[PDB]
Amino acid sequence: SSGRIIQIIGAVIDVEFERTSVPKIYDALQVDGTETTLEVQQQLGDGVVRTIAMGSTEGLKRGLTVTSTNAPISVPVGTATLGRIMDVLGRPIDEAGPVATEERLPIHRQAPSYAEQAASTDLLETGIKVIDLLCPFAKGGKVGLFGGAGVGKTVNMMELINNIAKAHSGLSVFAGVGERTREGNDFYHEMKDSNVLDKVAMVYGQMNEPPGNRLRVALTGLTMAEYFRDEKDENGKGRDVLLFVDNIYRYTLAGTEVSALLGRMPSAVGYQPTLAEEMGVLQERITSTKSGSITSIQAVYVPADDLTDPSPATTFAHLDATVVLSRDIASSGIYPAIDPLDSTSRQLDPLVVGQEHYEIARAVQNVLQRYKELKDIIAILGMDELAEEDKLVVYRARKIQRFFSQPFHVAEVFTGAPGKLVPLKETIRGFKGLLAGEYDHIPEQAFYMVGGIDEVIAKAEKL
Amino acid sequence: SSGRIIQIIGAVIDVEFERTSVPKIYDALQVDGTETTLEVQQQLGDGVVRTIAMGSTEGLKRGLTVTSTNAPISVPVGTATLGRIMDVLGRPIDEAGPVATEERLPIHRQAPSYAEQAASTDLLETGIKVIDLLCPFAKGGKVGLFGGAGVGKTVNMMELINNIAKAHSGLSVFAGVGERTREGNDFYHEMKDSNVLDKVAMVYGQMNEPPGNRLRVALTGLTMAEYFRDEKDENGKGRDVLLFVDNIYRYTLAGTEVSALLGRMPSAVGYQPTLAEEMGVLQERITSTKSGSITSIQAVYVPADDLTDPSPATTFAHLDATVVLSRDIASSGIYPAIDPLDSTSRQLDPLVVGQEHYEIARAVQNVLQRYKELKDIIAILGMDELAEEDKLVVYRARKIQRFFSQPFHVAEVFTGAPGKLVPLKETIRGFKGLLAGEYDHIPEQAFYMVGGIDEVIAKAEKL
Amino acid sequence: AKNEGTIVMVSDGIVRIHGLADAMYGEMIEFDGGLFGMALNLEQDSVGAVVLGNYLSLQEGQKARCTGRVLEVPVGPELLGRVVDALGNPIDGKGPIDAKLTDAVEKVAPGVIWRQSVDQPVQTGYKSVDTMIPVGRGQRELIIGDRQTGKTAMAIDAIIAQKNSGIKCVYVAIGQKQSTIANVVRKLEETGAMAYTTVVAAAAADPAAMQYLAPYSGCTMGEYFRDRGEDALIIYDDLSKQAVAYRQISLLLRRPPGREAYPGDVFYLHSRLLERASRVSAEYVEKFTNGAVTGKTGSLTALPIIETQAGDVSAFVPTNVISITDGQIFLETSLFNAGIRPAVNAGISVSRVGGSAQTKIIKKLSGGIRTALAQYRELAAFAQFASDLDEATRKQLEHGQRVTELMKQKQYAPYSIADQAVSVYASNEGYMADVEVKKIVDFDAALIAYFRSEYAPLMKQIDETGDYNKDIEAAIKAGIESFKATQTY
Amino acid sequence: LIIYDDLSKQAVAYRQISLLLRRPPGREAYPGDVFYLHSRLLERASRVSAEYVEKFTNGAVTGKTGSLTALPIIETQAGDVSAFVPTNVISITDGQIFLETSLFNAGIRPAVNAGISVSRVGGSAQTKI
Amino acid sequence: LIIYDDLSKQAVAYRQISLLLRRPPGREAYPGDVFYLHSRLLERASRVSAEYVEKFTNGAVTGKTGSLTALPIIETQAGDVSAFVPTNVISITDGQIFLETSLFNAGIRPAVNAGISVSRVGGSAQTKI
Amino acid sequence: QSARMVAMKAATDNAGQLIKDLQLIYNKLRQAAITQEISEIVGGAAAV
Ligand SMILES: Nc1ncnc2c1ncn2[C@@H]1O[C@H](COP(=O)(O)OP(=O)(O)OP(=O)(O)O)[C@@H](O)[C@H]1O
Numbered sequence A, B: 001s002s003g004r005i006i007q008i009i010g011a012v013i014d015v016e017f018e019r020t021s022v023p024k025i026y027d028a029l030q031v032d033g034t035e036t037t038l039e040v041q042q043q044l045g046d047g048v049v050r051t052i053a054m055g056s057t058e059g060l061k062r063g064l065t066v067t068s069t070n071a072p073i074s075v076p077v078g079t080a081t082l083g084r085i086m087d088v089l090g091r092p093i094d095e096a097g098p099v100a101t102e103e104r105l106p107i108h109r110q111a112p113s114y115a116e117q118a119a120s121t122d123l124l125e126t127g128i129k130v131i132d133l134l135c136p137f138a139k140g141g142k143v144g145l146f147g148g149a150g151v152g153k154t155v156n157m158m159e160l161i162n163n164i165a166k167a168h169s170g171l172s173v174f175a176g177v178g179e180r181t182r183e184g185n186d187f188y189h190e191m192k193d194s195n196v197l198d199k200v201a202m203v204y205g206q207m208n209e210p211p212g213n214r215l216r217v218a219l220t221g222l223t224m225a226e227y228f229r230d231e232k233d234e235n236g237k238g239r240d241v242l243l244f245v246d247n248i249y250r251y252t253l254a255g256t257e258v259s260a261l262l263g264r265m266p267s268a269v270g271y272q273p274t275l276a277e278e279m280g281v282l283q284e285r286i287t288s289t290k291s292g293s294i295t296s297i298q299a300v301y302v303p304a305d306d307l308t309d310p311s312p313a314t315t316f317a318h319l320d321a322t323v324v325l326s327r328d329i330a331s332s333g334i335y336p337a338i339d340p341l342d343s344t345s346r347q348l349d350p351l352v353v354g355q356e357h358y359e360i361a362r363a364v365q366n367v368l369q370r371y372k373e374l375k376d377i378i379a380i381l382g383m384d385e386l387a388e389e390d391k392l393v394v395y396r397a398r399k400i401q402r403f404f405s406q407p408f409h410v411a412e413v414f415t416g417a418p419g420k421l422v423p424l425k426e427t428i429r430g431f432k433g434l435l436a437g438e439y440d441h442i443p444e445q446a447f448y449m450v451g452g453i454d455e456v457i458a459k460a461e462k463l
Numbered sequence C: 001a002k003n004e005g006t007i008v009m010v011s012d013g014i015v016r017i018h019g020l021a022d023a024m025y026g027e028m029i030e031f032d033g034g035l036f037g038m039a040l041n042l043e044q045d046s047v048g049a050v051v052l053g054n055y056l057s058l059q060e061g062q063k064a065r066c067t068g069r070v071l072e073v074p075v076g077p078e079l080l081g082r083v084v085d086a087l088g089n090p091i092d093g094k095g096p097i098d099a100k101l102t103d104a105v106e107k108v109a110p111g112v113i114w115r116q117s118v119d120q121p122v123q124t125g126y127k128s129v130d131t132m133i134p135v136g137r138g139q140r141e142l143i144i145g146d147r148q149t150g151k152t153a154m155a156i157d158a159i160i161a162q163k164n165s166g167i168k169c170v171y172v173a174i175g176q177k178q179s180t181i182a183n184v185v186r187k188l189e190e191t192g193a194m195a196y197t198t199v200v201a202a203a204a205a206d207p208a209a210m211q212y213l214a215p216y217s218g219c220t221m222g223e224y225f226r227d228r229g230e231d232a233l234i235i236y237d238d239l240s241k242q243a244v245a246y247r248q249i250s251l252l253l254r255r256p257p258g259r260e261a262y263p264g265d266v267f268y269l270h271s272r273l274l275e276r277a278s279r280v281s282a283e284y285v286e287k288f289t290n291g292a293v294t295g296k297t298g299s300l301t302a303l304p305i306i307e308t309q310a311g312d313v314s315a316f317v318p319t320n321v322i323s324i325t326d327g328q329i330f331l332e333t334s335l336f337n338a339g340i341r342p343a344v345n346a347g348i349s350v351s352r353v354g355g356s357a358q359t360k361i362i363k364k365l366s367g368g369i370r371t372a373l374a375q376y377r378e379l380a381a382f383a384q385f386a387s388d389l390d391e392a393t394r395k396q397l398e399h400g401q402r403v404t405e406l407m408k409q410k411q412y413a414p415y416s417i418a419d420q421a422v423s424v425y426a427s428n429e430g431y432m433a434d435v436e437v438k439k440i441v442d443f444d445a446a447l448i449a450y451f452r453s454e455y456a457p458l459m460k461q462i463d464e465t466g467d468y469n470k471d472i473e474a475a476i477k478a479g480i481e482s483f484k485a486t487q488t489y
Numbered sequence D, E: 001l002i003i004y005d006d007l008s009k010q011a012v013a014y015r016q017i018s019l020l021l022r023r024p025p026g027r028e029a030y031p032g033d034v035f036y037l038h039s040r041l042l043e044r045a046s047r048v049s050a051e052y053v054e055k056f057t058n059g060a061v062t063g064k065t066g067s068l069t070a071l072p073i074i075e076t077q078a079g080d081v082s083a084f085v086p087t088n089v090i091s092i093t094d095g096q097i098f099l100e101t102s103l104f105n106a107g108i109r110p111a112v113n114a115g116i117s118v119s120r121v122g123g124s125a126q127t128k129i
Numbered sequence F: 001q002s003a004r005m006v007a008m009k010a011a012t013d014n015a016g017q018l019i020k021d022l023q024l025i026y027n028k029l030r031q032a033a034i035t036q037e038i039s040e041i042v043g044g045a046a047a048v
């Protein structure tokens, strides 16, 4: 009820209460006469609760008053949020008026039980033609996106955001953990440009914010995606939802910064005492229930190019697939620039996909590896020296790379490209035909910027 | 005289007392309620004594009562213990009835004075090629084996027991500290079937017991050997004694486990502040004074597989002969894995062993060091560039490294090959011939796991 | 008053209580709301406790009561084919499990004089681990390797192939995603193995207390059959995650840090657990059961799994574990990515039991294969820098290559004792010398086929008896000849 | 346009003034919040929009888009980039210019390393020519 | 001429006797006053002048000078001459004689490293020939 | 001349392998050093 502030040391604030009732862990508190909310992080006795504030603390003092909500940080969720931008507490920041949904749900909740899990592992079809053949995603699975700016990272995000709603009738949630303000504004305007903003939701927490704000932002996007998945249409089929996170590395870093402020015996290379617990509580709620499913695309950054660091080691135990973007492909003019030799997927086994799909993927990877080993010798020595068989490998690899590039549904403003959503069967058929050797007379130029093997047959017949 | 338990944490119990009767250091106390013997480790004013509990601590509450024996942990000595198995406190555990002797000795006493030390000069020949050639031993000395988990320390300790104690007239004491139980039972039965049990006393404290029992179990075997040394035949001469300690590292590891609870500050890599003094107060009592001669053999464990750790660094100076086991040679399949370099003995000088012995050992170590130094340029560049003499050094070093291998008597089960024994002069002759250059044409594949130069000729012909 | 106490501090799952004067070590405590806690530290004026549940519902001033009984788990033969939480509460929704008796969780192993030497073998279906690294009832072995390298596959293959052999099984999962546990349960139920198996689960979302405690409950449930003359086999899915949970719950207690910020007593935590897998003598069984069963010896096998970073076995926890178990199986990611499956390293993998724990024919046949493999590996690594090699080196390299190709297998494809016997006999005698390397695996398959259709009576005799006599050797040699003489691969 | 002489020296004084006040130690004794300290300063350099200017000045000035640039400076010990403060500041900013010591003494002045010096904005911040 | 068998053992004993006394630790857990411990001991080795000798003995001894040379000993861990204690001792002593394991094992005995061993006093100490 | 090309290319590949191994060792040592320094700092700060 009527509390007091006892100790302001930076963000950490100790708040005293009545003896009988001391707000439980994670119960949000409101400070009278000011915009600031407090989130309990540990109880110390004598009613003292040691908590962290959200937002800056200049102007506060010892002796104020605080009231208790007796509930965690409830965010407003519903269908209204789509197309808006909200704070960590779900407050609008794009100067577009209040949201029109009254449904408040907490962000602190238990994960689904063992009997609530699905009875199967199913695939998610996005028709990118390179993300389905070599690196298949799985409903409920998790993908780690490797690459920085300059290789069109946002273009792929736009394409997936559009495709999830166009083919599987689903909505998406975007949460940005410690992103730069300038590039955030650039992203927002870029998405408003392609007319894709009205299928997504956005939650932003920037670098200038106290680490408490950055740490508990991802849970807001998680709760919104949960509500998008849960609601059932007639026939109760549920929905398939996507969740994007800008860099989980900054999530862990905010976690360890918050641990020190509260004070703790460091562990390992300075990381927090409890490092995996946090990763699990974030990444065990991205699962596939019998009602619906949530997939997650998270971008990752490895410190010091050392995969043995505790943070990459802990986060790598949950990643089901990895996508890598190489600047060399971008320079070669092939979009999207996704490497066909350094991307991994745990779903590429004969048990899940089947026999012929697995054989196709492995055969194309083998041919590409052989071409990668052959290009060095063809450079130092001359092309003619090489055997006729390896030349064939070179030509097939070139055609394969060209075929791996397709137009997008969000680039029709820039070039008038209608956009393609290729079903997987056409991709497998075309690749099997190409590996067989029936597409040996068609010139290579017939493969670039084409959605399907027919388009290639039509394009190749045209010229 | 009756005290009440005040605090129980882990294996450390601190107990109050009356003002005028506080028990002294290292005395033993008995809990009236259950079977437990506590040992005093420190005094804390106000008549409060900190103690380590010998046994289980489950089921012990606060307010339990304790009586004081006013005397340290006494163990029975004499000839009654020949061919029996005993606990840490002397209680028999072989289910063969009580031990009939009133002769009790305390296990905490001062080290022998400087005036009564003795010089050890008589040599002792094991039968193992590398030990009897590069690291020679001498009666009444001290021997140590240093290795990391999985390298071969025990299989060598048992082989030395086979080649020495079985054929020696005199008593023996075997103390096991911080090791597997299965090995203890195997050793007991193996000694029983050979009808040599009646000459050996045994003490066992294994890894399954609380650190209190693992911390003070070497001193009991020490006291038994101490009595067996000073005892003299009536109108008759004394006899030799032998001592075997299975792992002395656990003795310090127990103190490390219980150090912080005693109130001591941490130091170096988490070790207790008082380490070397703790090692010395035990390693000095293993002595061969003017009365009798004790020949002890110990196995020392190397944490994390580096010799720079403080625990295997403090103990290097307490031994006469040191034998260092290498994991790389083990992974190479060379057995026993004894490093020719970094293995020394204080009995290798021209006076004690002769001239030819010294010259042979020195030439061998020189050749091996030369090859180890040469390895790097081979690693980067290749083989053809080196001088022909360096190629000869490479081949000789390989052959020498193989020739140090030898099958054992107690390791027939692992490999299915019978044991072997080699006289010292044969070792000398073989190494002299090898360094001479007369065995150059013999393929290096014939030098593996065969004992004596002749068996090698036969194996080379066999190929 | 002496049994009723209050809560004073709640922080990250550790609760410090007051009162509770007649409180003992290890004894459970019941919080309000049907939530249990375990005492860890006693002090002069307070009691420390870890909550085994969801501590977010507990707040200051709530009450707590001391049951008076040590932490224990329900145990019996009714727990077969069920899935339960660390304390034994079912979660699969198949209804309550009847349990006749409850056993304690904190116990010490039988002494030295109460044990026996392991001589009864255990079969897994993998050629390499049987011939190269034999195992036996009562012997502890460790499966160690890099991430996503095949460790859980080998541990499930043993549980599957133990059907038909009167061996119960317990499977403990610590720090696993719920998807993987559900998938494993599905796979177990498909092949009928769950008919004789038990599963204990503690996921990555579960607190540190349950993840730390679960393997003890698994061991206690597996001790029931060993203490009565029957056998059992328990598999800890990840000990490293248990160590990590212990590290977290100790650093939350401000205990001094150490190598890799691990406390001092991280060797006791693993030794007190891994040294309960023992073979007891008939005297122990007779005394424990009060003469109900006589002339029968118990046993309990353990197969814990541990994971290494960047493929090093020189770390702190891996070497702590290696020195406790009677062996280790090292799975190398470099070979796993290269196609050698299961990827096993002959140099590092060993077993301390040796030839005692296997059949007579396998013992006579699989002699010194591991050392030859390790020497071959070293020699081959040396031949890159060497320009000229003699004939003996060439022969050794070829033999090593053939043996390496032979020891390959797929998932869910068990091999009988006779199969391994025939394959190893063919390998040793050099009948594979003229065979092309690339066909070797396929060749192997054909052999077994030609020994199932004909020579079938021998096959049954070897499978049941496991006996070697000049007749068995002659028959196997004659069979091998016929196959190569008249057949195709 | 603002030019901070050396922030590396701001950090050192922040570490000292924090340790003197008994705040929790961490990597290099640095306090709990250092990344926040540098971000709170380097996130104030932006280019507001005309609506912001009009709202701030109550319509006194319109049509003009305001802007504050920033060029902070950091020095390294023995030419490393993996320390705590250098990594923080590298992560915060929008590009870096590397000045070497090998190039500086070899007579090459100014010593700019074009290999590993980048700017994210790039071509949008240059005149047409 | 005084010889100390191993001041390293002495430094460790000082660390134990100080840590037991509840004194603040530091690099490698060695408390303060570690430099003082070896400096005040190694500074007493010096040569006095004949006037000092004459004054001390009140004229009993005339026309003679006293001296006290020192040769202390310190051990290293795999060549880590940059640890806490060897650097202090190396900074105090006039000269340093280095013994190498890779030289001892090669048969070069005594194993003296000529390229790292120096003496400040130099030729003045030696005889004419 | 035809031998020198392959000789130097093999040398370059071996150098790449060696630098990879050295990088592994370097990372391990760096993490150990950071852990040791942090432990020492925390222990000292507890003393005062
Ligand atoms: N004979 C085989 N052929 C092909 N692949 C195999 C074979 N045996 C095992 N595998 C692969 O090895 C994997 C075994 O899982 P693995 O133990 O590597 O997972 P982990 O993450 O390393 O550990 P955990 O299973 O405990 O999570 C399976 O995914 C399977 O595809």
Ligand SMILES: Nc1ncnc2c1ncn2[C@@H]1O[C@H](COP(=O)(O)OP(=O)(O)O)[C@@H](O)[C@H]1O
Binding pocket: B148, B149, B150, B151, B152, B153, B154, B155, B156, B335, B336, B408, B411, B414, B415, C323, C350, C351, C352, C353
């Ligand atoms: N001389 C040897 N010959 C063959 N095998 C050996 C030899 N020495 C040790 N081994 C094997 O190495 C393994 C580890 O050795 P052991 O001494 O039993 O354990 P540790 O090295 O932990 O003391 C054992 O399982 C044993 O079979």
Ligand SMILES: [Mg+2]
Binding pocket: B148, B149, B150, B151, B153, C323
């Ligand atoms: Mg060992």
Ligand SMILES: [Mg+2]
Binding pocket: A317, C147, C148
């Ligand atoms: Mg895994």
